[PDB]
Amino acid sequence: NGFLMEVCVDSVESAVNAERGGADRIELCSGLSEGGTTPSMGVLQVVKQSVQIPVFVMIRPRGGDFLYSDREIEVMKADIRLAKLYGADGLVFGALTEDGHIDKELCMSLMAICRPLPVTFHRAFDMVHDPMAALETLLTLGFERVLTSGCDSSALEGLPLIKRLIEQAKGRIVVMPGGGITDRNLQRILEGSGATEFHCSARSTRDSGMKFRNSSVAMGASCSEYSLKVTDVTKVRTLNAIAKNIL
Amino acid sequence: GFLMEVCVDSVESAVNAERGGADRIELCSGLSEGGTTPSMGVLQVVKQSVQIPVFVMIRPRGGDFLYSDREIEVMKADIRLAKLYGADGLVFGALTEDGHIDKELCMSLMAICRPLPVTFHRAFDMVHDPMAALETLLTLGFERVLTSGCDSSALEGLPLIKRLIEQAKGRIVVMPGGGITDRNLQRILEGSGATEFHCSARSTRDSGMKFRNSSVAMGSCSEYSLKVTDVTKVRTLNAIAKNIL
Amino acid sequence: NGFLMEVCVDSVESAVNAERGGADRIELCSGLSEGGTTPSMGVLQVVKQSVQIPVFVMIRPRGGDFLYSDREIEVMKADIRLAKLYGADGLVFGALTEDGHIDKELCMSLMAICRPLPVTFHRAFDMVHDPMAALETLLTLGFERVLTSGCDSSALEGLPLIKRLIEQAKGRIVVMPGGGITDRNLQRILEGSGATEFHCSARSTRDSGMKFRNSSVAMGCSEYSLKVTDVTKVRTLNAIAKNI
Amino acid sequence: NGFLMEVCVDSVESAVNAERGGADRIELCSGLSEGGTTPSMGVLQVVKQSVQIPVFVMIRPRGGDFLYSDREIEVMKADIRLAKLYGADGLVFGALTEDGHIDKELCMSLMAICRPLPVTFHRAFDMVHDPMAALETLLTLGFERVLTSGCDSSALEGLPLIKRLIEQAKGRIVVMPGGGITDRNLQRILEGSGATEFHCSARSTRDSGMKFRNSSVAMGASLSCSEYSLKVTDVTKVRTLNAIAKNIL
């Protein structure tokens, strides 16, 4: 112990696997192939009745930017209210202005509907113009946590900025590295930032059980309709053994 | 009269679809994966912004339609919540390993959907025996099937959809879907005899963001583009439908 | 009979497979991922030494538009000279203006260098603003063939315009349907367009033979699959053709 | 050599840009979206009349693995011969066995034909079972350069392994890091590996000059529309990478 591991998840099997392999917290995502959108209340319900670890709930009404229209803001608020109702232990979101600044006013009204639950500000943070200022606005606003790959393609690549962010934060806010953390990665990202909480994916692909396949059909939008991505217990295990070995 | 259906992702799209003349919207999350079950908040707001029937997708992930116990229990919970929150219909599909429709599960799920009409979705295009499949959906009581004739699109699958509509004899509404555009609608309608049809009618638009950072990928081809149900596109698809009479 | 089947090909294995399946002509089109780029001269040579059927060579310096700069044009001319030299029976290219008109002057300039080989104007044609006018321009310039999917997502999809182009051509230019044709739609394509030459890619995926695999690495999908022109696919397309 | 920079390039404009930005060497590529395919011989000719820096040439008959059949290698042999004939200043291929070993016999054949030109073993090396042992056999075969990501998804990710490889190579072979190097990760990579030569891309993406556009058409793959965009190696990106290199030591 000493470190906390978060795993984004999309199914009851993945949630259970993640808890099984030593995750301390799960983020419930839909649309993870798009960075995560707000899950259905039905997965929340079954996950909550399947796992004891906290279940944080993603509030993103679509992929793309985090410049939300009034109608998207309305959808976000309803989803906050319902996520509470059905047992979320936390909430995750992010909102920017067109200039790459966090949107204070919108963050204010979304936070007000989230309280008492902890709220982490997500990778929208990586799309910000001035991150050091962004971090400042986040804490005056009272976000417990920020998920960041240091405004770069991944946590390892963004390490130097993660490091600086942790220093600026001084424990007032949990700066969480996220984006591309693997077995091969974790130690360097931990030892190089001073972070105590981290977010990882730890999925592996598994072929479908279908015996009859029809290669002609593409349902999605433009690799196979017969593979599944599932949070892998063994991967989650080795991430935890790495975390406990650096202490 | 024809009736046109449109999958939709957001309130904006739902609204656009309605004003462009759509007769029914399906609420989908995860369009890029063929449709996943949407949050309950889109439902609620959409249900307040629109007077047209709103069908809800019940699909706990992309990929196959061979669901585990924990997945079917997620589907069951979502069906109840969707009724609770105002759905006017449900959409879903389930197959066995052999590529047959899974009667037992369809029955289970059907039982929880009642009284709402259900449409068996594109799972159907992944069947080994469509004529038999259609028969068992028929005996199970699904009102609708969405299908591209087991091919990569409605135009490509047109001969089989035509045969299906012949086999159905109006007992079930065979709805062509899959890449239906303003350019192929007339052919798809004239060549199938279909009365209802499913399209997407989206156009991709640019983000309002002035500050951009090309280095991060949330994941995809871009983080600064949006696809929205286009009113113009829905409108002309509707115009094409009122020229085929 | 009276149908010629053309197949894009990447490798000698695909070339052989094509011919062995009944193809009448092959196009050598590196970079199939991107609609075809101009192949290495070394694949021409080995293919030319492995196959009896005519081998047409693709002249495309890159993916994307067909708005070629001078340096790109310079590269296209050099590659046209080299393809001739290494035994191409035909050349394939296409060039457009900013307003989606075919580029007359550049087409004449590349044509003059291609002679006497037949030339086919390719899918660039699908990106034109007025295809009926473009067609008239292509025959005025002497392209023997045009590859086209009716300016739409695929040949089935663009079929009604392909039909109108063939009626306009009056057999003065071969209008070759191409986008996405397979065994499930061949018949329809031919019967609904009246085309006599058609273009396809009858490829199938194979698993790599690598026993040891490193999933973390990428290259510039899967790092462990192969697409290969399929003999049995090509044969069936030939059978569908012979029986119409 | 003293931070030597190599850029792999699609076209002449990009080759010219790379030279102008301070690139020391260029690898000529076709099919960059697939990790590098053997380029037409016509690019080489024109590139060779537009640039003074050495121009190395990819010999790779397709994407995917480096498990080449007989006809594939007979194409590689012909392209090596053809590339020498047209001015290649170097060669770079690389092959493997099913087991993840470098294929010694095949490498000897291809090597025999490339001589006297320098050859680099490319990122087939990252797909190898045991990279230390692989480094030895490349050393035994006489490759002057290896392009490598330390067997991971990028040079940064594989930095620790590239460090150990440079440590064991002892200057006998040039260990050149490559995956995803940029102007925001060059310094870490040089500083944490001790490498003297490095490979990057330095591209930016431009909108096509096409004014009339047809969105309904896709040329290649599967609906992976683009479609008027173009990737060109960027003079100023290469220049900044070079300034960073010169700044280190």
Curated annotation (Swiss-Prot), chain B:
InterPro entries: CutC-like, CutC-like_dom_sf. Pfam families: CutC (PF03932). Ubiquitous. One of its GO terms (biological process) is copper ion transport. Changing C7A: Reduces copper binding. Reduces copper binding by 75%. GO terms for cellular component: cytoplasm; cytosol; nucleolus; nucleoplasm; nucleus. Keywords: Copper, Cytoplasm, Metal-binding, Nucleus. One of its GO terms (molecular function) is copper ion binding. It is found in: Cytoplasm; Nucleus. Changing C28A: Reduces copper binding. Reduces copper binding by 75%. Belongs to the CutC family. May play a role in copper homeostasis. Can bind one Cu(1+) per subunit. PANTHER family: COPPER HOMEOSTASIS PROTEIN CUTC (PTHR12598), COPPER HOMEOSTASIS PROTEIN CUTC HOMOLOG (PTHR12598:SF0). Homotetramer. This is Copper homeostasis protein cutC homolog. The gene is CUTC.
